[PDB]
Amino acid sequence: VYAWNRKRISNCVADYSVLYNLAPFFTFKCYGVSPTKLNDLCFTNVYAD
């Protein structure tokens, strides 16, 4: 946690329908956007930690 990684995501298509088997028992509680319609969105810069 102290040495958290940082990843850049760009020049690719992002899909959330696959994020079930890889991380079972997940919890996507989050802020600033409705998760229900993340399918129809575009992102300028995505960072994964």
């Binding site: 600033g32 956007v33 409705s34 998760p35 229900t36 319609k37 129809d40 969105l41």
Partner: protein
């Protein structure tokens, strides 16, 4: 300046209409002034209040 009154009437109407149409871009304290943007940015429960 002889025809000031009719010109004043026309200018008054034009500028009132222009102010009305321009005020549509006011934020009114929202995150965005475009309701489409609000719909694709938030879950409904806060979308109603925005």
């Amino acid at each position: 300046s002889a025809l000031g009154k009719l010109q004043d009437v026309v200018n008054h109407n034009a500028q009132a209409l222009n102010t009305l149409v321009k005020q549509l871009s006011s934020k009114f304290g929202a995150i965005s002034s475009v309701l489409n943007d609000i719909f694709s940015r938030l879950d409904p429960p806060e979308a109603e209040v925005q």
